[PDB]
Amino acid sequence: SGFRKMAFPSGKVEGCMVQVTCGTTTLNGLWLDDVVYCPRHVICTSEDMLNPNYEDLLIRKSNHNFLVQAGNVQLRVIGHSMQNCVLKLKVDTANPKTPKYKFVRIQPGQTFSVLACYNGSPSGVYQCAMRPNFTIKGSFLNGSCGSVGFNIDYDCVSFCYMHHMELPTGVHAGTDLEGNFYGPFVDRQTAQAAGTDTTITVNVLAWLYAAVINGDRWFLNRFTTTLNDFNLVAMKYNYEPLTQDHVDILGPLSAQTGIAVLDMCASLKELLQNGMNGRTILGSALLEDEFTPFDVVRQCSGVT
Ligand X SMILES: CC(=O)Nc1ccncc1NC(=O)[C@@H](C)c1cccc(Cl)c1
Question: Which residues are the active-site residues?
Answer: 41, 145
Contact with ligand X (CB under 6 A): which of 24, 53, 142, 277? Answer: 142
Do residues 171 and 143 make contact, with C-beta atoms less than 8 angstroms apart?
A: no
144 binding ligand X? (CB under 6 A) = yes
164 binding ligand X? (CB under 6 A) = yes
DSSP of 165-202: EE-TTS-EEEE-TTSPBSSS--SSSS--------B-HH
User: Which of a second copy, ligand X, none interacts with 275 (beta carbon under 5 to 8 A by kind)?
Assistant: a second copy
27-66 burial, b for 16+ CB within 10 Å, e for fewer?
bbbbbbebbbbbbbbbbbeeebeeebebeebbeeeeeeeb
Which residue number, 258 or 302, has a Cβ lying nearer to a second copy?
302
188 binding ligand X? (CB under 6 A) = yes
* Nearest approach, Cβ of residue 116 and a second copy (Å): 7
Q: Rounded to whole angstroms, what are the CA distances from 125 to 186, 226, 262?
A: 26, 39, 35
Contact with ligand X (CB under 6 A): which of 28, 42, 70, 166? Answer: 166
Which residue number, 3 or 140, has a Cβ lying nearer to ligand X?
140
145-167 burial, b for 16+ CB within 10 Å, e for fewer?
bbbbbbbbeeeebbbbbbbbbbe
Burial class (CB in 10 A: 0-12, 13-18, 19+), 214: middle
Q: In terms of Cα–Cα distance, which of 293, 276, 195, 202 is closest to 239?
A: 202
Contact with ligand X (CB under 6 A): which of 20, 165, 253, 259? Answer: 165
User: Which of ligand X, a second copy, none interacts with 278 (beta carbon under 5 to 8 A by kind)?
Assistant: a second copy
Dihedral angle sign, alpha carbons of residues 199, 205, 206, 212: positive
* Nearest approach, Cβ of residue 87 and ligand X (Å): 13
Which residue number, 122 or 241, has a Cβ lying nearer to a second copy?
122
141 binding ligand X? (CB under 6 A) = yes
* Nearest approach, Cβ of residue 158 and ligand X (Å): 22
Binding residues for ligand X, rule: CB under 6 A, are 41, 49, 140-142, 144-145, 164-166, 187-189
Binding residues for a second copy, rule: CB under 8 A, are 1-12, 14-15, 115-119, 121-126, 137-141, 143-144, 166, 170-172, 214-215, 275-276, 278, 280, 283-286, 298-304
